[PDB]
Amino acid sequence: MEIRIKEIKENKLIGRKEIYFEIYHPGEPTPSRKDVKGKLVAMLDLNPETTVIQYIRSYFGSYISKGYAKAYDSKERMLYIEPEYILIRDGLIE
Amino acid sequence: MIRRRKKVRKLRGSHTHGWGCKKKHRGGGSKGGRGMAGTGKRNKSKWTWTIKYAPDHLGKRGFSRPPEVQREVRVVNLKFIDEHLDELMQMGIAYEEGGKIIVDVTQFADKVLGTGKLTRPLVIKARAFSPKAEEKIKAAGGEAVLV
Amino acid sequence: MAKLAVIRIRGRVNVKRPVRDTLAMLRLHRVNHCVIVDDTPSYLGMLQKAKDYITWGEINAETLAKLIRKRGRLIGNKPVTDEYVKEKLGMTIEEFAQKVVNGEMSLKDLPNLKPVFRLHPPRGGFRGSKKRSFKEGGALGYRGEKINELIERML
Amino acid sequence: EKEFKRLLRVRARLKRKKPRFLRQEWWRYPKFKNDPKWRRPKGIDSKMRLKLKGKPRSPSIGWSSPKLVRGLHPSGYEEVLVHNVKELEALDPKRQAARIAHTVGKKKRIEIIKRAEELGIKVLNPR
Amino acid sequence: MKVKVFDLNGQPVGEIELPKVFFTPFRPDLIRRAVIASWTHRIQPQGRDPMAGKRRVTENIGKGHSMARVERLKTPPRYAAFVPFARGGRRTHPPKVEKIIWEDINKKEKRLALMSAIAATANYDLVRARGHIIDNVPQLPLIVVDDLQKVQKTRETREIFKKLGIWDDIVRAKEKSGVRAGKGKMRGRRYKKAKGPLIVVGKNEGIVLGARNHPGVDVVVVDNLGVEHLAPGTHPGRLTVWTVSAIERLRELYG
Amino acid sequence: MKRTGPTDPNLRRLIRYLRKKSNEYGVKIWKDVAWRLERPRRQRAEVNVSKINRYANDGEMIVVPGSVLGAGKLEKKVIVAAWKFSETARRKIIEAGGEAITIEELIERNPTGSGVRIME
RNA sequence: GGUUGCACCGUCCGUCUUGAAACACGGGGCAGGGAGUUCGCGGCCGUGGCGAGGUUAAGGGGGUUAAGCCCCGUAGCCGCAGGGAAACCGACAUGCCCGCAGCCGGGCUUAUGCCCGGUGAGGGGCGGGGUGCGAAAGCGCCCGGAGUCACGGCCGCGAGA
RNA sequence: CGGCCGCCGAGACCCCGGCGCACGGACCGAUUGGUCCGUGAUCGGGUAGGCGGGCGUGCCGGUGGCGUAGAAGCCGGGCCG
């Protein structure tokens, strides 16, 4: 598979980069967060536990999928404006 | 949420529209007479009914009480009182005599019945008691006082 | 023992629910699908009923080898060739056939091959007709080794 | 590159086409409508419901298209209706093509076409 | 979790503890049942005339003439009554005044729905979906000092928003979202604005007398707050601007 | 879903968390906890705290796919994890039991499915 | 795409009906209009809150331009014990045994998975119990705490339905 | 009429590719739903009827768009389903 970062917003008040993915999967599964997670760590050169991936949808079988992630400077700050539900779903803890 | 027409459809164009033959949808006859009609009928009508035990028989036999003659009572199990004891704080607690707690049932005015066990000694005052209720209260180390 | 190949020529239509179901119990549903059955009196019996609906007869080893090869497969696009049989169990396809013929093993034991083979029409068509029995010269019922012909045309 | 499997199905769709599945006999009465409109022959009587030959085909699911191919335009691409310049954003020029809505004026349309070609997105109209 | 309280110079001072309600699980399904319930309650009845079809007598035109036995009127052959096929005939199932108009929702249930809509504001993801565009990101929701409530003049409450960076949201609310499609506009409910921030105060009556002016801005107190204001059309995550006494009194959640 | 299937988002998300656990650690139990949630509403647990007391000795991890419902003794050192509790229930369990804890924090207690007993 | 020639096949539609191309019934053509609806009550279902209780209705305080929502009222209904016509009496927060899920143990396949022993909530089967009939016995009904309220819809009945 | 041989001749049956359903596995979502893979020889006619998914119409609310550099509507054509 291959992922590109399509559109970029930056909020420096809370010190993150926020990113939109346009995912190309060609006859292969709708991606888990984890498979996006290892590949993303290589592009950013930032730790895996700081990089938090949420919300994904899945189109009609055409081979584009959308999703969002956020890449954080500090690891206190993936828990200030981001609730329980994402984090547990990533598998950061445990 | 289900659109009835969505099911009826313009769809099914059954046009019968979940009724069957066209002849069927009509008057009282499909129903077998109006309402409860036909229960009584000796003749075929409804006999059997859309009741599970079918229809129970007709002749309500037996007699009426005057409303006045019915004292109401209000029954409570010892189980209810016993579980609630800590919640019952408003009602006195006397460790020395009276059992563990002194409860006048009369806060809920009632006849006390025997079901359940009694975890503590209770001194219970009530309008009435069953003999089973007496045995369990005494076994707990409590006492029963009749008002 | 003797092994027979059974093929249903006649469709589900005009069958008794007892015979039609018997055919399903033969592991034969449809037209032109063929099955391997052992000769036991209990086993024999299903075919006896079926007789009017079906063609049966004992096959040659050679003809059996051509049918296992093309037609056979539990699942998957993959054909049952020497190599595939070999991974199953036994040395090769030849041994595997000799063992089936002896009745030493079965297809199931060896798993990943089916008890039903979806066989071909006979080219030159049904061997006599669906109307009548083997004696009468028609396709139905117990046949000789001449079953070889019906199945070869079937592949 | 784009795929082979997608071509395979696109060719099937061309080749295969579709009958018409405009509602039962339509020529006969002008009442029986206007050039769209299937409704299934609900009648018992029907030869088309009886499915006698020559009485056109009635719809069955069997007739469909491959999912991957359904909804694809005739140059292979994927439609996105585009009302404006903002709608153009996040449109993959390689996969998708834009249709400017009929409603849209020349005044917006000049801005839309010129920006859509810089994004590399094939448009349609003008001017 | 603490949230900075801000002076009216648009700068932080202190940080104070956040109430329970803001942690509560996100539950659009609860809010939806609640929002639906409030809307149906503020519907005014609808009918159709009940004596119609008694003003049109209706008589039967017989047989023996190769038409139906369906009733017309005496002298003209026209529209009648006791028909649904005809022009002028009854409609079939006219609207009644006995039509449903209430949906209960439990006092326990409603408060939980309220909690659920306020909690949604703390979240970034709901807040951007709702359409509020915020330049003051770590300040979800924003609490400001008690002096803000006493302000009741439009010019004064305006200035303060620009300095806080939350005037930008009203700019959004200016964009028109109720010149509606459809003929029904004529009867009313056209040429109107859109929603924007919700302002909660503790004091200075039940509304602020200068903040009802501002576009899309709806004012309330904590003793009147309802799901409709907090998350209309079942879309929570609508930005709030809080008053220190309001946060304290909400702390005491009751019902 | 089509007939039976939570409309509550919090409940549906918990089932999805449960599936991942089943796969990654390879135990059966969490998936069992998913099927019990999956049942209709009048088929999910209604658990009494004198029913807790009566079954399974101290220090075991009770997983309840419904509600714990107080009034009744509970003298066991059992630790209850559950989808909801009464106000009344929470007190009995936290005074005698190992603790009252939420079921979405059950991950933190026991993610692997040793020493657990399902109860309803 | 229009039209037409050619090949092949095709005796409307809807309805009645066992059988309709019909010498069964209905229709000139077109446009518009046109039919599963509301309340109460019961039986179901899904979903949601709360919890051995649960919900308010009627109402007036309050808020608002008005009003909904908010908080307040808890009358009453149902549930929490049943049986009996009534008099009137009043029960298992567990004694025994299986065993689904799961947990625990051994063996086994590369793995999933499998075979076998405990432990077994939920569930299943006894015992002992309440009460009614009863000299008695024997059954009838009931018994080791889950419901209430809310929302949509299916279905019954009364209503023009 | 009693034999026989070669052929012709279905939507059956075989065979490539595709589609839906059912079931398993995985993933995705804030609900419904969707996607990816695997298995199906023993899944795919259909009236009464039962169920399940989508479409469209009118208006309301939120949200987010369009219009005199041309809306709706009308008529013919193009494309998708």
UniProtKB/Swiss-Prot annotation, chain B:
Entry coiled-coil feature ranges: none
UniProt keyword list: Ribonucleoprotein, Ribosomal protein, RNA-binding, rRNA-binding
Alphabetical list of PROSITE patterns matching this protein: RIBOSOMAL_L15
MF terms (GO), sorted A to Z: rRNA binding; structural constituent of ribosome
First and last residue of the signal peptide: none
Xref: Gene3D superfamilies: 3.100.10.10, 4.10.990.10
UniProt-annotated stretches for the region Disordered: 1-43
Family recorded in the similarity comment: Belongs to the universal ribosomal protein uL15 family.
This protein's name: Large ribosomal subunit protein uL15
From Swiss-Prot, chain C:
GO biological process: maturation of LSU-rRNA from tricistronic rRNA transcript (SSU-rRNA, 5.8S rRNA, LSU-rRNA); translation
Listed name of the protein: Large ribosomal subunit protein uL30
Underlying gene: rpl30
Keyword NAD: no
GO molecular function, one term: structural constituent of ribosome
Disulfide bridges in this chain: none
Quaternary structure, from the entry: Part of the 50S ribosomal subunit.
NCBIfam families in the cross-refs: PRK06049.1, uL30_arch
Gene Ontology CC: cytosolic large ribosomal subunit
Pfam families in alphabetical order: Ribosomal_L30
Protein family per UniProt: Belongs to the universal ribosomal protein uL30 family.
Signal peptide from the UniProt entry: none
Key words of the record: Ribonucleoprotein, Ribosomal protein
Domain of life: Archaea
UniProtKB/Swiss-Prot annotation, chain D:
Keywords from the named record: Ribonucleoprotein, Ribosomal protein
GO MF terms, alphabetically ordered: structural constituent of ribosome
Protein's UniProt keywords contain rRNA-binding: no
Gene Ontology cellular component annotations, sorted alphabetically: cytosolic large ribosomal subunit
Biological process per Gene Ontology, one example term: translation
Record-linked PANTHER family: 60S RIBOSOMAL PROTEIN L32 AND DNA-DIRECTED RNA POLYMERASE II, SUBUNIT N, RIBOSOMAL PROTEIN L32
Subunit structure as annotated in this protein's UniProt entry: Part of the 50S ribosomal subunit.
Family: Belongs to the eukaryotic ribosomal protein eL32 family.
Protein name per its UniProtKB record: Large ribosomal subunit protein eL32
The organism of origin for this protein: Pyrococcus furiosus (strain ATCC 43587 / DSM 3638 / JCM 8422 / Vc1)
Lineage per the UniProt record: Archaea, Methanobacteriati, Methanobacteriota, Thermococci, Thermococcales
Name of the encoding gene: rpl32e
Swiss-Prot record, chain E:
Keywords: Ribonucleoprotein, Ribosomal protein, RNA-binding, rRNA-binding
InterPro entries in alphabetical order: Ribosomal_uL4 (IPR002136), Ribosomal_uL4_dom_sf (IPR023574), Ribosomal_uL4_euk/arc_CS (IPR013000), Ribosomal_uL4_euk/arch (IPR045240), Ribosomall_uL4-arc (IPR019970)
Transmembrane regions listed in the UniProt entry: none
Example of a GO MF term: rRNA binding
Gene Ontology terms: cellular component: ribonucleoprotein complex; ribosome
Domain of life where this protein originates: Archaea
Gene Ontology biological process terms in this record: translation
Oligomeric form and interacting partners: Part of the 50S ribosomal subunit.
Annotated HAMAP family: Ribosomal_uL4_A (MF_01328_A)
Function: One of the primary rRNA binding proteins, this protein initially binds near the 5'-end of the 23S rRNA. It is important during the early stages of 50S assembly. It makes multiple contacts with different domains of the 23S rRNA in the assembled 50S subunit and ribosome. Forms part of the polypeptide exit tunnel.
Protein family (similarity comment): Belongs to the universal ribosomal protein uL4 family.
Protein name, as recorded: Large ribosomal subunit protein uL4
Species whose genome carries this gene: Pyrococcus furiosus (strain ATCC 43587 / DSM 3638 / JCM 8422 / Vc1)
Gene responsible for this protein: rpl4
